[PDB]
Amino acid sequence: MVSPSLIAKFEKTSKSNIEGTIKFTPANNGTVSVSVDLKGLPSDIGPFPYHVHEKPVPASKNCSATENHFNPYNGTVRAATPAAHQVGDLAGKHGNIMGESYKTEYDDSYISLNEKSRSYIGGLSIVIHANNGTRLNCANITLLDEGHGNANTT
Ligand SMILES: [Cu+]
């Protein structure tokens, strides 16, 4: 069995010009490949922490309603090795988003695409913050492909 790929789609509105995607695809050796492709960032208030948060973005697009970080193993915001960070603290482990546009690829060995895992991130959300913590934009983590099953194509 292999678990399905996920995506978070950020859209531009009157609240934020940030738009683009963060894709999560199963990779080699027990890791998930993360692909960040964002533009429209308000650079001078960055760099921009971003994290997996615990609740969905509601229809209102209120990023506060995503509540706190996904942290099933009670990690710490400051850490000296990647595994000591919260599972959801992508920026702490891999770097803050920065610039007006940001494109990067990396592996994360703590998030999970397997819905039976305590580290599963499906159905959660991602929030992008200004450096001072203000929530700028957010997106739900949803399935990437439309068609699944061992007898299907997409
Ligand atoms: Cu966050």
SS (H, E, C) 34-58: EEEEEECCCHHHCCECEEEECCCCC
Q: Is 94 annotated as a binding residue?
A: no
Quote the ligand 1 centre to 55 CA distance (angstroms). 11
CATH 2.60.40.200 assigned to 1-154: yes
Q: Which residues pair with 91 in a beta bridge?
A: none
- Tell me if 148 is assigned to a ligand binding site: no
7, two tokens: 């995506």
DSSP H stretches of helix in 80-148: 90-94
- Measured between alpha carbons, how far is residue 62 from residues 45, 65, 98, 133, 135 in Å? 20, 6, 23, 15, 9
Tell me the CA–centroid distance for residue 35 and ligand 1, in Å: 18
Q: Is 85 annotated as a binding residue?
A: no
Instruction: Give the span between the Cα atoms of 129 and 50, in whole angstroms.
Output: 6
* Domain chopping of the chain, boundaries: 1-154
**Which tokens sit at 113?**
């695409």
The H-or-E segment that residue 10 falls in is strand 6-10
Annotated resolution, angstroms: 1.4
The backbone region for 11, taken as left when phi is positive above 0, alpha when psi lies in -120 to 50, beta otherwise, is beta
Q: Find, among 111, 11, 17, 99, the residue nearest to 61 by Cα.
A: 11
